[PDB]
Design a binder for this molecule. Structure first.
Ligand SMILES: CCCCCCCCCCCCCCCCC[C@@H](O)O[C@H](CO[C@H](O)CCCCCCCCCCCCCCC)COP(=O)(O)OCC[N+](C)(C)C
Lengths: 57, 69
């Protein structure tokens, strides 16, 4: 019953954050304090859309 | 004897006419009820033969701790 539309590999190319979990945990509080707006926008998009293919940007 | 114990024939005539009318309506109603019961059991769109389903008020429309659902 139809096909599943998946994004291409080049649509999933992004600069990755390659620090370990301890580094993230050390700066978790300041990360939440400073980068709150894009994180909240992405989380809102993820919840309303309910689809990983609609919140890639 | 006729004056004291019995009545005229028109009385019995009209009485049995009324009885016949009543019985005919009852027979027609019985047949119609059978047909209606058959149809509404086959289709299920009538008031009778309604079987319960799951109430939609039990669903929780809130964030579920995961984005997808
Ligand atoms: C004239 C002399 C020579 C000829 C004799 C002829 C003999 C005839 C007498 C024998 C009577 C036969 C018994 C049949 C009784 C029928 C009962 C019923 O059909 O009558 C009802 C009413 O009953 C009657 O009033 C008669 C009831 C009397 C019962 C007879 C019993 C007598 C036996 C004697 C017993 C003696 C006892 C002694 C104790 C020691 C009628 O119902 P109703 O819907 O309202 O009236 C419709 C007609 N209207 C509307 C025009 C008025």
């Amino acid at each position: 019953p139809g096909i599943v539309e998946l994004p291409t590999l080049e649509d999933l190319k992004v600069q990755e954050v390659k620090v370990s979990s301890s580094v993230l945990k050390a700066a978790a509080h300041h990360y939440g304090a400073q980068c709150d707006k894009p994180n909240k926008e992405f989380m809102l998009c993820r919840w309303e859309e309910k689809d990983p293919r609609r919140c890639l940007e | 004897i006729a004056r004291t114990f019995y009545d005229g024939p028109e009385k019995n005539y009209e009485k049995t006419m009324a009885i016949l009318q009543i019985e005919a309506e009852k027979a027609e109603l019985r047949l119609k009820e059978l047909e209606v019961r058959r149809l509404m059991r086959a289709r299920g769109d009538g008031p009778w033969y309604q079987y319960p389903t799951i109430d939609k008020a039990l669903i929780d429309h809130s964030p579920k701790t995961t984005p997808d659902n």
